From a paper:
In this context, we recently proposed a lanthanide-based molecule, named the crystallophore (Tb-Xo4). Tb-Xo4 is a cationic complex with nucleating and phasing properties. In particular, we show that Tb-Xo4 may provide different crystal forms of a single protein and correct the often-encountered defects in crystalline order that may result in low-resolution data as well as twinning. We prove that, beyond these crystallization properties, Tb-Xo4 is one of the most efficient phasing tools compatible with serial crystallography approaches.
Thia­zole synthase (ThiS) is an enzyme involved in the synthesis of thi­amine diphosphate, a cofactor essential in all life forms for amino acid and carbohydrate metabolism. ThiS consists of a homo-octamer for Methano­coccus jannaschii, and was isolated in fraction C [Fig. 3(a)], where it represents about 40% of the total protein content. Four crystallization conditions corresponding to three different space groups were identified in the absence and presence of Tb-Xo4. Crystal form 1 was obtained in two crystallization conditions. Contrary to FprA which was directly phased from the 10 mM Tb-Xo4 added during crystallization, the co-crystallization of ThiS in the presence of 10 mM Tb-Xo4 was not sufficient to derive useful phases for SAD phasing from crystal form 1. We thus applied a 9 min soaking of one native crystal into a cryo-preserving solution containing 100 mM Tb-Xo4. The model is composed of six protein chains, and 49 Tb sites were modelled with refined occupancies ranging from 0.1 to 0.58. The crystallophore can also be used to directly derive native crystals, as shown for ThiS as well as for the structure determination of vitamin B12 transporter BtuM and the structure of propionyl-CoA synthase from Erythrobacter sp. NAP1.
Residue numbers in the entry:
A (entry chain A), B (entry chain E), C (entry chain E), D (entry chain A), E (entry chain E), F (entry chain A): 1 to 261
The structure:
C-alpha cells in the first residue's frame, strides 16, 4: 500500500522557521546551560530537567555523544562499573557482565550516546547541536551565562558576532579540554584561575577523584566529567565511564541544592 | 554517599577487545546489510530486525542520523506528513501539529536520529559507525554482500585492504549520493547500470515517487530513501521526511516477502 | 665495555655521496625495471635476480611493502592459500594454519613485507624507495624503460625534470591503480590501450584470473599483481595474497623465457 | 603451470579477525613496551626478545624503520662504525668498507630497516605498526605501561578513547622528538622532568654521549637512541648509526639486569 | 670607510610607484607577448628584442627560469647538444664537454636561467614575473593579445577582473601544459583546436620534432618549446635542452619574417 | 634551417649524475658557506669568491633572489642609494636616477636578482638552490659548518637525515628571519644567544645600523643583510637595498681579513 503524500516547499520551510524561532526565544534564558553533549553533560542535563528546571545542553558538533561513539581505539564497546551502571540502565541501555571482573559491565558504544541523549530529552532537557560556546557572560564575582556561535560559522572562519544565553549556572562538561574554564581563565587573568590539564593515565586514581573534583570552580560555573580532572590535574581513566556518569549526576544534585529545587 | 569505584586499565581494555571480537565474528555473515545510518536506513533496519532477521546498519561517520541533525538550513526542526508520523511516534518521538497545515507534524531534528537509532537497536538491529562501505561482493547475476573499510583509514588515505560482510540482501540507503549503486555501476560497466542523480526540487512529485522507486535495482541490491530518487532521477523534497521513513519501511517489507517465500 | 666511537661529519657525508653516485651510475641501465614494491613486485624481483638478471624495484613511498602492512581493515594479519604459502616460507616468514580451512595460512602483516624485501635484496635485486615512475621510455612498437622522479619533488609539486632508467622489460606492479599502464594509455592514445580498472569483489574469480591476466600488455611492458586484474577488468579478492605472489613469480618466469630464447 | 586457487571472502575475514584478536589479548600485558620502530627501538626489542622476554615494539607509521630509509638527504646509504657494524652483520645486512676511513662501513639504507625488523621478529619481538603511543600508565613513583591509539584515528582527528598496554618497563625510542618522555613531563609537571631537546651537530661528541645518556629517566621508563640525546641535551651525529644500535643493545642489557633475566 | 646613507619611506615608495606606473603604461601595447619565462620563452624574447621589437615576457611565478633550476631529478645540471650550445655561450654560460659523447655539453642548472634572463633583458626584452596569462584577446580569425592577472590574486582565489596587453603576436611558451593554447581551445570550441598533450619519453624523436612543431597554431598565436610538442602530440626528451633553445630562436625568426614582410 | 639533433636518455642522465656527484664531492668542504641567496648573500659570495676563496651559497627555494623579485608591494622596482648603486653597476644592472631625490637610483626588480646571481657565479661562487640549512656544525667555542637538507624532503615532511658542509666561516644571510642564528640560539641554550627580531620601520635608522650590525655573532658565524638587524633589534628599511649590498660586501671584507686573503 503506497500512500499519496501531502508535500510542498513553502509550508515545510515556514513550519521549520516558526518552530526554530519560538525555540530560540525560549532558550535565551535558562536555569542551567550545560556546555558539552558528552556522557557527563547528558547525565547532568537529564537529572536537572527531571526536577523541572529549564536546561539547555550545547554541543559544538552536529551530533552529541562526545567520545563514547568510538569505544576504545575504535573497538565499539565501553565499560561501566558499579554503581554507575544503574544510570545507564535507567536510560534503557543493554548491559552485559564482564566475566573475569565482578562490578564491570560492558555496553555497545553506539547505543549509549543515543539512549543517554534520548533520556535527557525525555526528562525535559533541550539539546542544541552545531552550537559552539566561545565565551561566558560575567557579572560582579560570578558567571551569568554563555556566549554562543554557530559551529559552521566558527569552522568557516567567518568574522561574525555571537548571541547569548543567560543562565543561573553554567556547567563545563567539555571533556579533557575544559574549554569553558580555560577560556574564562585565559581572557580574565585578574581572576587567578589556572587550568593545568589532565595528568597521565591511572584509572584507579583518575576515577576516584572525579567526584571530589566536580565542584563550583568560580561562582556560577561548575565543572564535571573529564573537565573536572583537567581543571584539578587528575589522572585519566580510559574507556571506563562510571565516574563520568556519577560526576554528571553529582553536578546536577549540587546545582539543585543551590537552586533549592 | 561517597563512592569507592573499581577501575583499572588491563581489564577495561581486555573486556572491550573481547566484546568487539565476539561482535565482529558474528556480524561478518548477516541476512541484510544496510548501508547508511540515515532516516530510511534506520527505519529499514528496525522493521527487518523486528521480524527476527540478522541485520547490520553500516554508517561511515562516527555517529548515525545522516542529514536529520541540522534540520533545515541549521534551524533544528524537521517536518513529517501523515501517515509517516506514526513511524516517529512508534520510536517515542514527540511531535507537534503544524498550525494551518493538516497532516503536517514537526519534530526536534536532534531527537529524531537519537530515538530512531535507539528503536532500531531495541528491535535487534546492530549499528556499526565509523565503517565505510567501499565496494560490493558479487556472485553470478547478484550482489552477495559488502566490502567494508574503517572510516579513519579511508579518511587518512592509508593504503589498507578492507574486510567483508556476507549478506543475502544489501540496501543502499546512502542518501542522494547513492554511493553503493554508483560504485556497482562505475566498477562493473558490463552490468549497464546508470545512476543519473536526483533532479531539482519539487516536494510534491519528489515525495510521491520515493515508494515507486524503492525497489531491487540489481539482484540482491535494494535502494531506499533519497538514494531511490537519485538512482531513478526523481525530484528532491527538502526537509520533509515522511517519504524517507515510509521508503525504509517498504524496503524492509519487500525483503521480508522475498526471504519468507 | 666503554666504547670510544669514531665519528665525524665530512667522511660520513662523503661515503654516502660516493656510494649513492656509484649506485646511480649502475642502475640507469637494467635488464628489468619493476614499478611497485608491493607483494607481487617484490616477488617478481626476487625470482628475476635469483637467475642473475640486473633488476631494480622502484617504490614511490619511503618504505616498500605496499598494501600488506595494514592487513585487513587494520587487523594486522593476511591470508595466503596453497601453493603460494611456499613462496612466503622461502622468505623465512612464519605461517600458521587456519583452523577449519585446509589450504589457508595466516601471516603477520608486518613480517611479510620486511622479509619479502630482504629476500629480494638477498637474491640480488636493487630496491630504490622514494622514487616515483612518472612515464615510460618508448621505442618503435615497444617500451624501453621508465622515467623516474623523486617522490619528495613530486609531492612538493616542484617543476623539475626527471631522469631515466633504460630496461629490456618493465613490470607494472603498482597495484589496482595500474599507474604505469594507465600513463602509457593516457599519453599515447594512438596505441589503443584501455585500462578499465578492477571490478567489484569476488575472491574466487578474482584470484583465479590473476595468472591468466599476468602478461605482456604492450611489447616490453608486463603487468602483474592487482594491476593485471585492473588492466583486464578482473574481480578483487581482498586480504588473500596467494595470487599476488604467484602472479609475481609467473611474471619473472615469463620474462626469463623471453631473455633466454 | 597455473593452479586453481581456493579463495573466498568469509573465511579470509574470519581468519584475520581471529588472529588479530588472539594477538591483542596477548599484547595487553608485556615485559617491555618499546615506543618507536627505528634503529635503536628495533635493536632493543631484538636483544630483549632474544632472552625470552615478552616484548612489543609500537610504531606510529604503517611501516617501521624510522629515519633509516632515506639515508642522507635522500642518498640511500647510511654509515656504521666499529664495533656497531657487528649488530648489522648479525641481522644479515651486507656491509662495505669505506675506503678512506678505517672503522667505517656503509650499507644500503633500504636493506637495514627491513633486516633489523625481520631480525627483531625472529628473536620473538612483536612489532605493531599504525599504533601511536599518546600517553603513559602511571603508578606511585613509576611508569607502568603505555596508552595506545590507532594512527588513522589520531591522524583523522577523531575524538576516540585509547586502549592500554601494561608493561614492567617502557622504552622511549621515538627519536629526537622524545615524544614519550616529553608527554610524561608536559602532563605531569609535579615530576620535575625537563626535555631540553638535542643540540646542534657534532658527530664526535654526539655519538660518544649516547651510551652515557641511555638510562632510566623515571622509574620504569628508559630512553635510548636519539631520544637519549634529546632528553639530555646531547649533540646530533648525522647519518652515522653506530651509537643508535649500541644504545638500543645497552638499553636491552640494562633492562635484562633489572628483570634478572 | 663609514657610510652615512640617505634613506626614507616616502621617496622610496613614490619612486617605485612612479616607475611601475610608467612601465605599465608602456607594456599594455607590445609587438610580441611571450607567455612563459622558461628556456624557450627567454630565448624567443632575446632574439625578438635583439631586432628592435617591443617585447614582454610574462611569467606566472615570482622568478623566471621554468623547469631549468632543478636540473634532472634535483641533480643541478642540464645537457645541451650542438648547435644549441652556442645560444648558451652567447649568454655567457659556462659549458663543459661531456666525456664520451661528442656534441653534448653540460651546464650548471642555476647559472642557465639567471644568464638567459639577463641576456633577454640586455637585448631589450621586458620580463614581468608574478603575472599569470588567464585568457587571450580575440579578433576576427586571429589572436590580438593576452589577458593578465596577478599571480597572488589568482593563487588567493580572489574574484577580481584582469587587465590586458595588446600584441601583434602571442607566443605560447608555457611548457608541456600549453596553457595558452589549451585555454583558447577550451573557451572557443567553435575554432576546432585540439591540444592532445605530450606523448611518452623518446628523446631522439622528441627533440627532432620541436622545430617542425614550432609554428603558428592559430593566426597571431605561435607555439614554441615543450608547448609545441604538447599541442602536436610529440614525445618528451627529459633534461636535454638544445631543442628548447633552438625552438625559441626559430619562433623569433618566424615572427620577424612576418613583421618585416 | 632545422638541424638533426643528437639526443638520448641514457647519456643525458649519466652526464647529469656524473657532474652532480663530482660537484657534491667538492662542495662538502668550503672556506665560506653562505646561507640565503638574497641580495646580501649574493653580494657576500661574489666578493669572497672574487678573491679566490671556495664559497657556496645555499638557497632553500628552487630559485635565488630572495625578496628582490616582487619589488615594493608587487610594483616591480627597487631603490638603491649612493654609494651602494656601484655594486649593482658592477653586476651590469641598468639604473635610472630618481628625479626628486639626489642619491637615489631605481632598478627593475627582476633584473637585479638575475644579474647579482650571475655575477656571483662569474666571480667563482657556487650557488645551490633547493637546499635548506636546518642546523649548524659545532666545535669547541665555534661554528664549523652547516647541516643541509633537500627543500622538497623538508617540504614533504619526510623523516630523513641530512648531510653536511664543513666551512671555516658561515654567513647567516637568511633575511629578517635570521633562521641560522635563531636555530643556533634555540638548540644551544647554554650559549646565551638571543635573537630579538627586527623593530618597526624607520628607513633612516634601519639603513644606518646594518653595517654596524654586520659582525661575528658567535665564533665562525657572521650575520649580514636584514638578518644583522633582526639579531641586533634594528629597524626595517623597506624596498631600499643600499645597506643590503654594502652589508654583504662588508661581511666578505671582514672574513677576508680573518682568513688573511
Ligand atoms: N566550547 C564548546 N562548546 C560546545 N561544545 C563543546 C565545546 N568544547 C567541547 N565541546 C563538546 O563537549 C563534548 C564533551 O564530551 P566528552 O566525551 O569529551 O567529555 P566527558 O562527558 O567528560 O567524557 C570524557 C570521556 O569521553 C573520555 O575523556 C574518557 O576518558 C572516558 O571516561 C564533546 O562532544 C565536544 O564536542
Ligand atoms: N559508502 C558509505 N558507507 C557507509 N555509510 C555511508 C556511505 N555513504 C553514505 N553513508 C551514510 O549514509 C547516510 C545517509 O543518510 P541520509 O540522511 O543522507 O539519507 P536518507 O535516509 O535517504 O535521508 C535523506 C534526507 O536527509 C535528505 O536528503 C532529504 O530529505 C532532502 O531531499 C549518511 O549518514 C552517510 O554518512
Ligand atoms: N608510479 C609509481 N611509481 C613507483 N611506485 C608506485 C607507483 N604507483 C604505485 N606504486 C607503488 O606500488 C606498490 C603497489 O603495491 P600493492 O600492494 O598495492 O600491489 P600488489 O603487489 O599487486 O598487491 C595488491 C594487494 O595489496 C591488494 O590490492 C589486494 O590483494 C586486494 O585485492 C605501492 O607500494 C605503491 O606505492
Ligand atoms: N608517540 C609515538 N608512538 C609510536 N611511535 C612513535 C612515536 N613517536 C615517534 N614514533 C616513531 O618512532 C620512530 C623513531 O625512529 P628514529 O629513526 O627517529 O629514532 P632512532 O632509533 O633513535 O634513530 C635516529 C636516527 O634516525 C637519526 O635521528 C640520526 O641522527 C641518525 O643516527 C619513528 O619511526 C617514529 O615514527
Ligand atoms: N598561464 C601562464 N601565465 C604565465 N606564465 C606561465 C603560464 N603557464 C605557464 N607559465 C610559466 O611558463 C614557464 C614554462 O617553462 P618551461 O621550462 O616549463 O617550458 P620550456 O621553455 O618549453 O622548457 C621545458 C623543459 O623545462 C622541460 O619540459 C623538458 O625539456 C622536458 O621534456 C614556467 O615558468 C611557468 O611557470
Ligand atoms: N634555513 C635556510 N636555508 C637556506 N636558505 C634560507 C634559509 N632561510 C632563509 N633562506 C633564504 O635566504 C634568502 C634571504 O633573502 P632576503 O631577501 O630575505 O634577505 P636579505 O639579503 O637580507 O634582503 C632583505 C630584503 O629583501 C628585505 O628584507 C628588505 O627589507 C629590503 O632591504 C631567502 O631567499 C630565503 O629563501
Ligand atoms: Na565476510
Ligand atoms: Na591592453
Ligand atoms: Na637511462
Ligand atoms: Tb501505487
Ligand atoms: Tb528572567
Ligand atoms: Tb513535566
Ligand atoms: Tb560495590
Ligand atoms: Tb582485583
Ligand atoms: Tb556485592
Ligand atoms: Tb544568587
Ligand atoms: Tb581538544
Ligand atoms: Tb594547553
Ligand atoms: Tb589519595
Ligand atoms: Tb548537601
Ligand atoms: Tb552461512
Ligand atoms: Tb512503540
Ligand atoms: Tb492545501
Ligand atoms: Tb487540525
Ligand atoms: Tb528489554
Ligand atoms: Tb536465493
Ligand atoms: Tb556527497
Ligand atoms: Tb506522474
Ligand atoms: Tb507486496
Ligand atoms: Tb647497454
Ligand atoms: Tb629459502
Ligand atoms: Tb570448502
Ligand atoms: Tb588440516
Ligand atoms: Tb651471503
Ligand atoms: Tb629484442
Ligand atoms: Tb590510488
Ligand atoms: Tb570462467
Ligand atoms: Tb611457458
Ligand atoms: Tb590454464
Ligand atoms: Tb600479570
Ligand atoms: Tb623460543
Ligand atoms: Tb676500534
Ligand atoms: Tb682521523
Ligand atoms: Tb685495529
Ligand atoms: Tb619492582
Ligand atoms: Tb618531530
Ligand atoms: Tb619544543
Ligand atoms: Tb667530554
Ligand atoms: Tb652491571
Ligand atoms: Tb597602437
Ligand atoms: Tb654574446
Ligand atoms: Tb652514438
Ligand atoms: Tb671530443
Ligand atoms: Tb650597456
Ligand atoms: Tb596584419
Ligand atoms: Tb602542470
Ligand atoms: Tb619521422
Ligand atoms: Tb623562412
Ligand atoms: Tb626540415
Ligand atoms: Tb680540509
Ligand atoms: Tb680564477
Ligand atoms: Tb654621498
Ligand atoms: Tb632631504
Ligand atoms: Tb655630491
Ligand atoms: Tb682558527
Ligand atoms: Tb619567515
Ligand atoms: Tb619569534
Ligand atoms: Tb644613533
Ligand atoms: Tb681592519
Amino acid at each position: 500500500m503506497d500512500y499519496k503524500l501531502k508535500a510542498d516547499e513553502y509550508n515545510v520551510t515556514k513550519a521549520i522557521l516558526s518552530s526554530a524561532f519560538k525555540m530560540w526565544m525560549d532558550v535565551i534564558e535558562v536555569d542551567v546551560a550545560i556546555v558539552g553533549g558528552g556522557p557527563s553533560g547528558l547525565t547532568a542535563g537529564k537529572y536537572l530537567a527531571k526536577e523541572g528546571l529549564k536546561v539547555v545542553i550545547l554541543e559544538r558538533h552536529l551530533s552529541f555523544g562526545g567520545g563514547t561513539w568510538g569505544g576504545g581505539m575504535g573497538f565499539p564497546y565501553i565499560v561501566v562499573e558499579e554503581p554507575a551502571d544503574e544510570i545507564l540502565r535507567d536510560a534503557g541501555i543493554k548491559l552485559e557482565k564482564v566475566e573475569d571482573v565482578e562490578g564491570y559491565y560492558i555496553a555497545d558504544s553506539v547505543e549509549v550516546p543515543a539512549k543517554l541523549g534520548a533520556s535527557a530529552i525525555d526528562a525535559g532537557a533541550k539539546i542544541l547541536t552545531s552550537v559552539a560556546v566561545e565565551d561566558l557572560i560575567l557579572r560582579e564575582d560570578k558567571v551569568a551565562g554563555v556566549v554562543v556561535q554557530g559551529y559552521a560559522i566558527e569552522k568557516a572562519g567567518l568574522h561574525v558576532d555571537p548571541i547569548t544565553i543567560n543562565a543561573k549556572y553554567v556547567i563545563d562538561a567539555t571533556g579533557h579540554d575544559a574549554s569553558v574554564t580555560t577560556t574564562l581563565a585565559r581572557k580574565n587573568k585578574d581572576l587567578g584561575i589556572e587550568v593545568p590539564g589532565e595528568k597521565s593515565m591511572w584509572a584507579d586514581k583518575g576515577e576516584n577523584s572525579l567526584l571530589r573534583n566536580t565542584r563550583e570552580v568560580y561562582p556560577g560555573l561548575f565543572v564535571c566529567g573529564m573537565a573536572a580532572n583537567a581543571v584539578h590535574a587528575g589522572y585519566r581513566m580510559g574507556a571506563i565511564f562510571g565516574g563520568m556518569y556519577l560526576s554528571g549526576k553529582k553536578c546536577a544534585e549540587m546545582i539543585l541544592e543551590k537552586l533549592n529545587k
